[PDB]
């Protein structure tokens, strides 16, 4: 019944030949040009990153061999010639740099630069180059590429030129300004990148926080500081509100701001915002956008946060729009979860009222978090954020699991999840002679998934007599909608329900209790004989009023006409 | 003031040198090994794809008998993963040139048919993501050619020697690295095969047991697919346990190549944020959605040849293509659902029961008026001009409109009885336009966002009642002036009510448009007000209604009782208008009123 053909049957004879791995350069160029990036526009990102790196090298170079010039990135679109041009005033390239760096796929001069640096250096974390392929993204959109380059050394200017097809040319040129100018002659299906507004869209999308001024057709673009890199000390609330509206594409204010920077266990520069209004985070690296919707760095229940996470250390996929499977990323996610939880807890103690209102707006996310995480200490960490009412506190007052333990030789935390307080207080099960009252949606699924908190089990609780019994018997046969009617102040009756789950389901089998001492019931009894219509109308009205007061009839519209008929025929004797 | 440094200033001197592009092979190997694929498991996919290609080359070449299979073997004690195919194999120049050169693909040389998966020439090196050492035994079919053993580190060199006992085809053995030993466990490997290669055209055996690989039904002739085949395939792709209530098998060649199957489940939803995207029987990843968000209730599969694959085979390459495909699929699904509603209106009624919230969401969230109206073609309602229970559409409503009419009138109420006896419908009956009856909670928000349909403005009965004030409102009473309050009585009553409800209504008027109801609350933009409260009203009285005449008599006779009754009438109109706040505080007052009316 098993069919396997794999056996140790092979034996090498003769001798082995040795061979070095090779690489077909033309196919690699084609792969970068058509198969690497999900969108053509990304060539702009790559070229701008290169310009940034160039300027960064010059800044590094001016620390000792000091001297000169402005540090800028300039873009120019020519819609008539169909050209895109980028020029940086950076370190430039001599002929060996052009031949070696531009001419060799996967050779990165910026990688070699970074590897030679003292790790403490600024340039160590600002250089956005590793792979040695970004430049070839230009052939994604261009039939021809020309590069004019003038190195900062004292060296002629050069023109490098190619059509992307396995060969390029190098000649000497005048007069190249120090730095590098790249002219892309766009393909017919890419002329959109000779349009100014299109280019500006792309620049703001990926490179809006590049550390150097970016000019387009003589006008400056990137006026935004990357606030997540700066000392939390130096950010106004105004900086944060403007930055939040930009990064969240919003128009309100952040109600909470967490500016989290850490160097251990990994490099983290981030800002998280909780919006003011009632209901993602972008991933960056070295100030360049990776994902506008970071996918695996936060847990799914923290998707209500807005803002930015940047890490120098995150291993990037070759396309720079994905991350690589890594234990580092799961560690980062766990770290950020702990950090956000600690932040939220401390908010809840620094301002309990603001936190109450935060939890009323966003608690569904923490209920979901508790329900979905597998680790019990994480469930309890999140569960510290929950609020409830309690049998031992007035209505409206919020309390926590910690305070419930605080008011306990007692071993267990008893709870009752119900649509509202009236049904909870009249629960048969609320026969406890403290009970958490959990009125919020999905509360009971949350508490069941949580199981225990701080080692204590969360446990669910789950005038007369003439015709008291003919009055009541008449009512039993006239509303056969309730299963019992029994006799028990200001109200003539109330609706009571045995198990809260049934009421929950109904809102998506009740007991009626009557007060034989108040006037409308004595007169329901008195008009069971005298006037049967009026007694039926009054009966249905008392039932409906008890349903409303119990909170299980929130749209009384079906009753209104009947009520009017009751009223009209009750006032007919006036 | 502009600041631009870019000027046409540069010119060549002298002569040019010519150069060929080069490649740093060592770093390229490192990149394939650590930076190309976002997930290690895909090496299995790549190797299986290679085997499939080999078998295809054999299948093609022997159609001018041998077994054609892929075998996978896991050895958890030696930490080894082994794959062997019975395909064409490789001679020594194939091993040296094709395996030895990154981005060199022999499958390019093969072509010239649509079954070959490989195009990039790098998939093989995916093995070095998970393996310290790789060995390849290969025997080419073809012919008078010895067997070979190829072996390597991943580190810049590999070895080739002649070998005996090599079965025709290719066997690759991966010595897994220590933190990749998961791919030495059978259940993990089967997970990966099922995930990526469940539709491979050849049998795959794992440790001597054949894996249940599937036919790719979306590529096949729709008429040749039974309902049971669709039920089984639906259960697989949706990972479900019910059956599809609807099946749409959609193939197209223009404007794009499309092979797809969509299912609507029989069960009711629970899923508010779904279709798999494929190419050549190998899975791509939906991360980005190819359907609009309102169609996320669909299950199934989309395959399109026009979608370009990224080097890692987990992203797609032009998002304008994706928006075009999304619009095509949206159009096609709408057409399908409309045709379902006309071939079986009752089954469609239960579908619209169960899933209408998705179409409402689509209408509310889309920016384009033609798309809102396209989706709105799916909405169903009842009508004042149809028997209770019978459903109609916006298109049928406009088919019954008399030529001199400009607007589509609707009324939102909990059910048909409440709509039919609505005070607002009583006022609309005095006109003679059909009124749509909408029963679902978010119908009115939907219609407000839809605004117009087929060039006709959508107007609520409440709004129209308010507007008629500001026109010739030539409507007079159900009851002759004999059984009404006169003008003296009416305006004395009204003055009293203005003084008894001073900060609760903006004006109080008599209206001629009511019959059964004593009063109603009117607000110009009533739907928007209802919506707002779910986070200046006018009270209109029916001086022909008994409760109003007796309020008139009781302001004099019994002032306290008259105030209690007045506040009750106001509350009743607020409730009937869907503008009432929690009705619980009223109950005590109501009880008191009742007790004082029953003496
Ligand atoms: C316990 O764990 C938990 C879970 O399980 C994991 C959960 O799934 C969840 C959440 C899922 C429930 C249709 P709409 C609509 C739909 C999706 C988005 C937005 C809106 C609609 C919106 C509001 C109200 C009703 C319907 C619509 C919108 C406009 C017009 C018409 C309909 C929680 C909170 C949780 O806590
Ligand atoms: N504008 C520029 N000015 C100076 N040197 C440049 C410029 N653009 C590219 N270079 C050089 O050319 C090399 C190749 O660039 P590129 O192909 O983009 O790879 P990379 O920037 O090194 N790493 P990556 O961008 O992540 O692939 C760089 O490392 C630089 O040495
Ligand atoms: N099992 C095999 N049998 C025969 N030839 C094979 C086999 N595996 C690989 N080859 C050869 O080696 C080449 C390189 O394989 P590979 O690196 O996987 O790239 P590819 O399949 O051609 N394209 P891709 O899968 O998209 O990366 C193939 O084109 C074949 O010529
Ligand atoms: Co042996
Ligand atoms: Co160092
Ligand atoms: Co010139
Ligand atoms: Co007509
Ligand atoms: Mg670069
Ligand atoms: Mg391959």
TrEMBL record, chain B:
Query: Record's Gene Ontology CC terms?
Result: mitochondrial inner membrane; mitochondrial matrix
For this protein, the record's SUPFAM superfamilies field holds: ATPase domain of HSP90 chaperone/DNA topoisomerase II/histidine kinase, HSP90 C-terminal domain, Ribosomal protein S5 domain 2-like
Q: Which organism is it from?
A: Danio rerio (Zebrafish)
Q: What is this protein called?
A: Heat shock protein 75 kDa, mitochondrial
Identify the Pfam families for this entry.
Answer: HATPase_c_3, HSP90
Q: Taxonomic lineage per UniProt?
A: Eukaryota, Metazoa, Chordata, Craniata, Vertebrata
Q: Where, by residue number, does ADP bind?
A: 50, 85, 98, 105-107, 119-121, 124, 170
Q: Which residues bind ATP?
A: 46, 50, 85, 90, 98, 105-106, 119-124, 170, 313
Q: Does the keyword DNA damage apply?
A: no
